[PDB]
């Protein structure tokens, strides 16, 4: 929960 | 620059402490997120303290280490710089858009960069600098040929060495590069900083062309920007989905962070891992997500550097072969899953495996090389050509 999400697919 | 006695390591402490007491100011209300001063300074102190314990009675040989001398000088200059930032800034410190305030954020970045560098060189408090492992191997070979086991070199010494391989065509371009690569802003280049930049700008072969295309000429590149700043900047674009920008990630240095606007108007931030920036930018454009850099209608064509000199193949040796046969299998095969040929090299460690296993390990919340369990700072795709 660091602010970063997974790459857009 | 000057020799480090324990009176000095004392002086830095007193000085870091003042910078903290300033930032604790209720009127300041600094946001808690990286980079965050009220973490960084204490944590740097902790780490220094840790190095000191390790050097007890050896204080003579620690004082003489050049990297450490340079660190403690820069660390002092920077804290001092921060303390007089407040002094002259007065109340303009509390206007979140104030120029003093932006300088304070620039400084937060730097303090962060300094601590990461410090942990890199003295991981457990013991000086590893001479043994530091550069992630990318061409990069490694460059540094070692030019600088030996040196942990740190003056900027002009770095500029001259690099120029011999990748030509810097001007002063302006040289200044832009210094500003990009000198993260601690000390006029020196550490082997650590070399690592970050070569990771950021790979492949090594097209490293200056890469950096020109991704930073110098690119409307989406944001130097010394913060996750919170990236969010604020894209706010003006929340109505134009496909707008995107990108910056160094501070919590994982040497990795890229891409902010973008989504079909429904949210600002999200992602990290390509193990994947080179351009491919991500190329795919992201093609796939609709990364469209208008910093909002601009025009998006750069990076297909230019899409055509890198291929990494070689490793070619198992008669020695290896006969060994893997007496073991019952082929060296070429991934000794993790046992169903695949090794397609990827873990860096810096060098260990070989199949990408499926690498991906499954990482997705499994596993960390570091499944073999030696050193941290995976990089990946290079490869092919093995068997002995037969």
């Amino acid at each position: 929960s660091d602010g970063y999400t997974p790459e857009p697919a | 620059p000057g020799t480090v006695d324990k009176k000095m390591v004392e002086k830095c402490w007193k000085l870091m402490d003042k910078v903290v007491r300033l930032c604790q100011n209720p009127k300041l209300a600094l946001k808690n997120s990286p980079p965050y001063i009220l973490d960084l300074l204490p944590d740097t102190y902790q780490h220094l303290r840790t190095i000191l314990s390790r050097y007890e009675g050896k204080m003579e040989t620690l004082g003489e280490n050049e990297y450490f001398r340079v660190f403690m000088e820069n660390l002092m200059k920077k804290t001092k710089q921060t303390i007089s930032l407040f002094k002259e800034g007065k109340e303009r410190m509390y206007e979140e858009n104030s120029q003093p305030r932006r300088n304070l954020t620039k400084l937060s970045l730097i303090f962060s960069h300094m601590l990461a560098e410090l942990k890199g060189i003295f991981p457990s408090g013991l000086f590893q600098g001479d043994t530091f492992r550069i992630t990318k191997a061409d990069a490694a070979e460059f540094w070692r040929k030019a600088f030996g086991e040196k942990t740190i070199v003056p900027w002009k010494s770095f500029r001259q060495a690099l120029h011999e391989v990748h030509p810097i065509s001007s002063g302006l371009e040289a200044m832009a590069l210094k500003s990009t690569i000198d993260l601690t802003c000390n006029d020196y280049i550490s082997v650590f900083e070399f690592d970050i930049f070569t990771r950021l700008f790979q492949p090594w072969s097209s490293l200056l062309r890469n950096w020109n295309s991704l930073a110098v000429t690119h409307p989406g590149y944001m130097a010394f920007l913060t996750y919170d700043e990236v969010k604020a900047r894209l706010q003006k674009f929340i109505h134009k989905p496909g707008s995107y920008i990108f910056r160094l990630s501070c919590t994982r240095l040497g990795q890229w962070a891409i902010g973008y606007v989504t079909a429904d108007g949210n600002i999200l931030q992602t990290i390509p891992h193990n994947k080179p920036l351009f491919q991500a930018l190329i795919d992201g454009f093609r796939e609709g997500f990364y469209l208008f850099p910093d909002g601009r209608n025009q998006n750069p064509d990076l297909t230019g550097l899409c055509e890198p000199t291929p990494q070689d193949h490793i070619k198992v040796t008669q020695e290896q072969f006969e060994l893997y046969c007496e073991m019952g299998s082929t060296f070429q095969l991934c000794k993790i899953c046992a169903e695949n040929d090794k397609d990827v090299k873990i860096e810096p460690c060098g260990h070989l495996m199949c990408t499926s296993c690498l991906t499954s390990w990482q997705e499994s919340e596993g960390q570091g090389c499944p073999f030696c369990r050193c941290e995976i700072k990089g990946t290079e795709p490869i092919v093995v050509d068997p002995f037969d």
């Binding site: - | 019952g328 993790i336 899953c337 046992a338 169903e339 499954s360 390990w361 596993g366 499944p370 073999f371």
Partner: protein, 146 residues
């Protein structure tokens, strides 16, 4: 999963661990039985212990489930045969082999880790009266392991 499990079982019959062996039960390659002869640096000396090994389909990115089928008196192993051993949880890595696991389980017999007990009762004995421990331990080998 499979092709890897198959290989571990091969490499296992090539270079057999000392005081340890393992292999599939029936046709099920995900379920093995293992034996560990309690080492001579332990009160379990001269005993013979049975374990089960269950390979999750996650394997080898998740560790195997290993447990004692034979009763053993130990601070790190309970009535259920469950073993508190680091490499079986947090310290797992996919390059590890059953051979390594077993070997370590043997280590844990010679030298238990009471700072992290499964059976709080027994942990206090091993620490306080070590003779008392060795005695019950040798006795449980007597009964169950011999």
């Amino acid at each position: 999963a499979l092709k890897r499990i198959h290989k571990e079982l091969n490499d296992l019959a090539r270079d057999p661990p000392a005081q340890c062996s393992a292999g599939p039960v029936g046709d099920d390659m995900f379920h093995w039985q293992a034996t560990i002869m309690g080492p001579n640096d332990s009160p379990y000396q001269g005993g013979v212990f049975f374990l089960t090994i269950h390979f999750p389909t996650d394997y080898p990115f998740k560790p195997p489930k290993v447990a004692f089928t034979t009763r053993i008196y130990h601070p790190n192993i309970n009535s259920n045969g469950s073993i508190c051993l680091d490499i079986l949880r947090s310290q797992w890595s996919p390059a590890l082999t059953i051979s390594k696991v077993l070997l370590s389980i043997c280590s844990l017999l010679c030298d238990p880790n009471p700072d992290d007990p499964l059976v709080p009762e027994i942990a206090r004995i091993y620490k306080t009266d070590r003779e008392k421990y060795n005695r019950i331990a040798r006795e449980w080998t007597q009964k169950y392991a011999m």
